[PDB]
């Protein structure tokens, strides 16, 4: 089986509303599903909540449920060979990109599309380590670690991400901690500032 998996903080947003946030350590991999799936190891199912208890817009509630239905066997996430991988096992397409912890980038397109096969890499540790080293040298650019997934719809280019039906945020805790260690050592990303004081 798999080994040396990473702990992830998974957060889900239904129409710009946070409905799920859990710190998951799944050593046999995890699958983000839309309904109550049977407990299977490997690939632990992680059930996203029913939008009935979090939303009141009927049309949004029906279409979010349509996206959750399209998850099927779920969005598989696993670590293998210094890299992170994502595979959609259902009918709903998924687009991914790196971004901030509270804001995916809407000015650019997605870094790629989630592969239906098993060769869909969504993160590589080599550029993260190289950017983290340069960040500690005074580059002003911190390495990105937050993985955003847009489920069922196109990536929100030039459109408020809070309008998307299902947005999932995946944060590897080991990478975030490594960036907090660099910031604790004296590094910074605050290159530009313009305070208005009178």
């Amino acid at each position: 089986l798999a080994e040396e998996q990473w702990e992830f903080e998974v957060t889900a947003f239904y129409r710009g509303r946070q409905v799920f946030q859990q710190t998951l350590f799944c050593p046999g991999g995890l699958r983000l599903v839309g309904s109550t799936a049977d407990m299977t190891l490997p690939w632990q199912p992680v059930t996203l909540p029913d939008p009935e208890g979090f939303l009141t817009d009927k049309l949004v509630k029906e279409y979010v449920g349509q996206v959750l239905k399209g998850l099927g066997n779920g969005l598989a996430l696993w670590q293998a060979g210094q890299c992170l991988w994502a595979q959609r096992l259902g009918h709903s397409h998924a687009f991914w990109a790196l971004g901030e912890e509270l804001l995916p980038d809407s000015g650019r397109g997605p870094d790629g599309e989630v592969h239906k096969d098993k060769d869909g890499a969504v993160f590589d540790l080599r550029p993260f380590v190289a950017d983290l080293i340069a960040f500690m040298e005074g580059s002003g650019h911190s390495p990105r670690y937050t993985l955003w997934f847009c489920m069922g719809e196109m990536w929100p280019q030039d459109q408020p991400w809070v309008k998307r039906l299902v947005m999932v945020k995946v944060v590897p805790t080991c990478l975030k901690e490594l960036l907090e260690m660099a910031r604790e050592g004296g590094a910074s990303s605050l290159k530009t500032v313009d305070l208005h004081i009178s």
Binding site: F25, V129, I133, M136, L178, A182, G186
Partner: protein, 39 residues
């Protein structure tokens, strides 16, 4: 040594959580040397 590079928190992180950070530090002497550069 090496463990001295980890952060000190009010609520400590589990050993298995810190193992994911140490494996990246041991597998990358280039990153581990840069952390010592900031010490």
């Amino acid at each position: 040594a090496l463990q001295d590079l980890l952060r000190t928190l009010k609520s400590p992180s589990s050993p298995q959580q810190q193992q994911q950070v140490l494996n990246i530090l041991k597998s990358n002497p280039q990153l581990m040397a840069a952390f010592i550069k900031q010490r």
